[PDB]
Amino acid sequence: ACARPLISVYSEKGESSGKNVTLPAVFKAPIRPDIVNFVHTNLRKNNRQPYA
Amino acid sequence: RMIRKMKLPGRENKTAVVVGTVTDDVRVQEVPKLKVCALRVTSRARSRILKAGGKILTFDQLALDSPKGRGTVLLSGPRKGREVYRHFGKAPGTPHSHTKPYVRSKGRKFERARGRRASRGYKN
Amino acid sequence: APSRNGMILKPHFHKDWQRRVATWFNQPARKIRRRKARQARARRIAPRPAAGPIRPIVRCPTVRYHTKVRAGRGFSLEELRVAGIHKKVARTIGISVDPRRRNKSTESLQANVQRLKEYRSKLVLFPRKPSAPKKGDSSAEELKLATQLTGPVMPIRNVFKKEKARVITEEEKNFKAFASLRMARANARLFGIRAKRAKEAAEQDVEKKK
Amino acid sequence: SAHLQWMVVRNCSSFLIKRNKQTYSTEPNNLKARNSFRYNGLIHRKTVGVEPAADGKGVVVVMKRRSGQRKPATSYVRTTINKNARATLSSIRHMIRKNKYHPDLRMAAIRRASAILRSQKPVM
Amino acid sequence: PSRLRKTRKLRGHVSHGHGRIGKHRKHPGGRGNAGGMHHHRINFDKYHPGYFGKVGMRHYHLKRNQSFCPTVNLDKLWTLVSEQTRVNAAKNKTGAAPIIDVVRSGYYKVLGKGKLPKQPVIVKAKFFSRRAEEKIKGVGGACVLVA
RNA sequence: GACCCACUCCCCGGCGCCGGGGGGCCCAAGUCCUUCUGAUCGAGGCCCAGCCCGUGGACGGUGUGAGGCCGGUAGCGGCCCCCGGCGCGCCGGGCCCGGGUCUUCCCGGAGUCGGGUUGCUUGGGAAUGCAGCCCAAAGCGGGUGGUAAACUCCAUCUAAGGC
RNA sequence: CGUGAAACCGUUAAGAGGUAAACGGGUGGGGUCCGCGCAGUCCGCCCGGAGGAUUCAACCCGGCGGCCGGUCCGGCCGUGCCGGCGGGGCGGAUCUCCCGCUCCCGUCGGCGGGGGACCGCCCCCCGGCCGGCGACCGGCCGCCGCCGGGCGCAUUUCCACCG
RNA sequence: GGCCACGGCGUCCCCCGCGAGCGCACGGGGUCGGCGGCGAUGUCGGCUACCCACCCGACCCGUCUUGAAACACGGACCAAGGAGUCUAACACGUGCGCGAGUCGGGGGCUACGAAAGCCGCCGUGGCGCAAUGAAGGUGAAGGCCGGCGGCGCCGCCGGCCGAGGUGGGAUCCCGAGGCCUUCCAGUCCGCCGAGGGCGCACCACCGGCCCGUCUCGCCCGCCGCGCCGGGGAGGUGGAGCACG
RNA sequence: CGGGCCCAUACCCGGCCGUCGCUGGCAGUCGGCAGAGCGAGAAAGAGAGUGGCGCGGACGCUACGCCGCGACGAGUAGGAG
RNA sequence: AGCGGGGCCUCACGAUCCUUCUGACCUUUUGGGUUUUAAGCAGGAGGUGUCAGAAAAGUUACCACAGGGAUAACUGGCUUG
Ligand SMILES: COC(=O)C[C@@](O)(CCC(C)(C)O)C(=O)O[C@@H]1C(OC)=C[C@]23CCCN2CCc2cc4c(cc2[C@H]13)OCO4
Ligand SMILES: [Mg+2]
Ligand SMILES: [Mg+2]
Ligand SMILES: [Mg+2]
Ligand SMILES: [Mg+2]
Ligand SMILES: [Mg+2]
Ligand SMILES: [Mg+2]
Ligand SMILES: [Mg+2]
Ligand SMILES: [Mg+2]
Ligand SMILES: [Mg+2]
Ligand SMILES: [Mg+2]
Ligand SMILES: [Mg+2]
Ligand SMILES: [Mg+2]
Ligand SMILES: [Mg+2]
Ligand SMILES: [Mg+2]
Ligand SMILES: [Mg+2]
Ligand SMILES: [Mg+2]
Ligand SMILES: [Mg+2]
Ligand SMILES: [Mg+2]
Ligand SMILES: [Mg+2]
Ligand SMILES: [Mg+2]
Ligand SMILES: [Mg+2]
Ligand SMILES: [Mg+2]
Ligand SMILES: [Mg+2]
Ligand SMILES: [Mg+2]
Ligand SMILES: [Mg+2]
Ligand SMILES: [Mg+2]
Ligand SMILES: [Mg+2]
Ligand SMILES: [Mg+2]
Ligand SMILES: [Mg+2]
Ligand SMILES: [Mg+2]
Ligand SMILES: [Mg+2]
Ligand SMILES: [Mg+2]
Ligand SMILES: [Mg+2]
Ligand SMILES: [Mg+2]
Ligand SMILES: [Mg+2]
């Protein structure tokens, strides 16, 4: 969607400080689990060592 | 194609519906105020449509606007634009068959002598 | 055995190809080694440009690429003697030189001379005995500011002359480009035979007139 | 949204048990503990959950508020109820029906409440 | 993924999908594409007409760089510059026409395939075609030659 | 060679001084309470400092299954030995070294090139490269310019010596 | 000498044995085990009989929550727009003050670069409308609901038994 | 005598729009608001698993083969091992990202990590966006309005229309009329519908354009007037164009 | 030549399993802010307006789910799920 | 008027590669030009009779291998000249 709320920046004490920032649109980008799984499958193969 | 089919007479200010992709065309100069619903529109085509002053919808917005599809123009791209269809049909090397052959490369030495010349035996 | 419509292929696998199969599993290691050697050389040559000597402007040879410039081997001896630098001093101060390059036109020669002059105004020279300065040596104010630069010293970028809109003249409107090209082709094709025919025609002319 | 979240978690969640030709979901606020869009306790804007009190007597009724969807800490308001069976059922029934708080599941809620009260009743 | 292949479904069947009568032999027709004239002749004729023989002349030392010549059409011609240029040209009243460098863009010959918007131009190309030049003139404009 | 301009910042044989590599010895915290077991490294607890360390929660050993029992692990952590280079001044040694213009002189690799034939080789096709035999050079010459040959113009290198 | 299967063998127990053994379908008979079967199911409403309680409804206080105010006040957001005598970053094959280079007897005129104008996009300050807060709320008011505590004291409500 | 989906008043023309209750059932697939016995050291239940008997059926598997139980071959028994794999190319079909563009795979910059991220004046390049010819080469619409010259045609001109047609086409558009609660009229929304249309993709057919070739022909241009260059009409060959 | 009789996996009626088709039905769980419906020979509204006490209502819908109607069921070589 | 681009009709014949002749004010011969030469384009011819077209003599009683009951010699079966 286009509605982006504001997220507060929490202090080291666990309680909210006065600062707050707008939600970046990346969190509003579409979620595609099928292609996330596809990309993960095809990229997890690049760290394999050979054997024979 | 979208502009031509929407500028056909009688079907003014209707909504064109494509269940495919709407793609930008570069050898066109004037874009009319169009009303488009499609699964996806390329970025440059979206920019052209919006700057012309039209509207682009998704299918849920289309269902809310007109649940019965009343006042719509249903179009589709050329189904036989793919290059594989120039290889289908009557086989080459057969009379009156303008079917493209499968050749690794196009050139003088590649499949042009025996069945294609009248001097080299026969021409189909 | 071919089956139905396919494309008949010619695989070059009839030799002992499995004995020579060069894999690329050491590619990341090679990249790391190359980058480490690059850093070692750069740190070894302390203030000098990390990408070695400067190199001149060069037109690509063939018609397919002759609209592009690039970096060549070295500056030519005519360019050096017009810029005023000595053949054996240029390499010491960091200028690439080759005695093979010819200079067929003045434009490239002048462009390279101007490039050499810019580089010569640009570099900073150190006293090889720091406690004793010299004549052409720089001063401590810039000796303190000297630092290495990344990438090529003076990047070679091709630029296009800006051409503004013009009102079209009637001669330009009435020029026949296609006809001119065709007649140019025909003249170049028929020149020699036309000269020959004129020669023999004048031969019969003098035979009858003498 | 709820439908999108369901399309993500319908088969790839960590609360999902698939054995003996039966399917079950173990998220906290799931009445009937079944893998279902209606009865899922995480993807909806408003759910309820009937759980036994840690004291061992009565039930705890969880309601999800309206404002803090993205704030988990202050999203569920708990109501502890330690009364007799009929009035506990009446209280739950009113909390659902009168508020019109996701009325698809009031009967399931009171079934779970009756089961929990029976369980708290000592065995013979 | 070998778990999705046809070999897992053929476990148990005797012939592994190759029939009992005519077994899976090694090379029952010849290695490669041999027999193109004798026992695969009609396959070669029905799908590869012209495959045998010689035709044309021979060139000993060819140079694709020598023969290199990219082409562009009037349909794509106006896309080689910023449309700001086209807007300014169609807006101004002096009549000055923009300059196009297909050589700069990366083309050598200009072919005229489709419509050209009615707007004066000057095209700087290496080669032209007769119809491309005619359409440029009909728009009203010049064609110049460059080297 | 003449005429002008410019320069006393190079290298090494030895001596002395200034701060990566190989080796050795080392550097945190539960064997706490209770309870299982043949044996604990299991289980529960250790508060309001949610036992203690953590730049150390890799691994191995120890009577199953251990971050805190031991060796280790992290750290631009410590100490102790030997070697090299980058620098320093010193003693001595070689060498007294350049550039611009004008003029006068000088200027090159042969049984090799090239040609005929034979054989092998190459994608190289009226012969790509190599070798044998026969013939066997020139100096505005010689080779190359992917079709043999004569004539005629250009382009481009300088073979048969070497690192 | 961990675990210790199958083929094959010994012994114990049971059963059976003239158409080799073995097999499918249907029964019957006998065994070894299981149900920890052997007085048989219950779950709600109502009537009656015996009992016991902090005990029901209504009301008061306090807290929380859900839906609203045809059109309550205040905010935020736009894959919204319009305004601007605003302040900027990015890009343009849209235009045009100075500097460097070279060509000339401090000069006419050329090239590269920096400076400014315009256009397009975006961020920010101000104003005005549209929509949303159901991916995105605060206060007040109103209704309803729940919980805690009082007050209610037993023809109410609820607990366990019996027919 | 026997039978019946016969049952009021009101006139105008013809001949002669809602009763209340009950109950029974040959009525959109079974119920009893019906019963009886037997159960503690010998009985109850256990379609399967262990042994035995009887009745019926029943030839030993794999394999080549028209034909196998075969007097066709392999097989004493048991355990472990044991045979369509990987690389490259191609073709089609499916899923994904972008899209007239797309792709960093080579290079470079920044424990798991030899991973990951980034580069755009690193897109050189590959494939696609143009075909055809052996090659030199060439390289993808026209018409109309008005006049001058050599009816018509060509050019100077100016301006306008401007990127095919026929048939079938899923869908969409309009609408002669109509969808009731007493009866009349008309208002808004919605729906149905005679008939009539703008037609996607695709298919068939007819025209058109590009390249090669053949035949018939006359016009145009000039720095070089020529063994020069360009053009038309009609057939035919192409793995072409005809809004990717 | 006549009556009767015996039985196959064939035919009829019934139950169950699967496949195919209807590219069938269900978001209507719209509940005191409420009013229960879309199965019945024959198109299209449970249409809107203008004048003449007691607080109650089973299951459902992993929509890749559930439900209903009919028909169908041999198989080597081979293909697919 | 018509008839005729072989024989009144049903037969009488031959691909790639290579060679040879014919044709053009034809193309290329490669850094430019002239000229021989060579290669292209189109149509004929030289031939494959195993006639959709490998270039091809025997012997093995010294023999070998893969197979065939697709195929003989001995037995068995149908038939009975
Ligand atoms: C160890 O010696 C063997 O084995 C015997 C032998 O060599 C001998 C015969 C031959 C040298 C001619 O083969 C052989 O081949 O016998 C074959 C045989 O195997 C026993 C079966 C056959 C077939 C069916 C009955 N028949 C039995 C004899 C036989 C007699 C023959 C004949 C063929 C056969 C064959 O043709 C002329 O008379
Ligand atoms: Mg096959
Ligand atoms: Mg099978
Ligand atoms: Mg198969
Ligand atoms: Mg077999
Ligand atoms: Mg086969
Ligand atoms: Mg095979
Ligand atoms: Mg251990
Ligand atoms: Mg412990
Ligand atoms: Mg421990
Ligand atoms: Mg450990
Ligand atoms: Mg320790
Ligand atoms: Mg330690
Ligand atoms: Mg060879
Ligand atoms: Mg030499
Ligand atoms: Mg040499
Ligand atoms: Mg043992
Ligand atoms: Mg035994
Ligand atoms: Mg016995
Ligand atoms: Mg029997
Ligand atoms: Mg038997
Ligand atoms: Mg066999
Ligand atoms: Mg047989
Ligand atoms: Mg058998
Ligand atoms: Mg037999
Ligand atoms: Mg035998
Ligand atoms: Mg055999
Ligand atoms: Mg045997
Ligand atoms: Mg095994
Ligand atoms: Mg495909
Ligand atoms: Mg039946
Ligand atoms: Mg059947
Ligand atoms: Mg079947
Ligand atoms: Mg004729
Ligand atoms: Mg005759
Ligand atoms: Mg051949």
Ligand SMILES: [Mg+2]
């Ligand atoms: Mg030549």
Ligand SMILES: [Mg+2]
């Ligand atoms: Mg020459």
Ligand SMILES: [Mg+2]
């Ligand atoms: Mg003998």
Ligand SMILES: [Mg+2]
């Ligand atoms: Mg036989």
Ligand SMILES: [Mg+2]
């Ligand atoms: Mg016999």
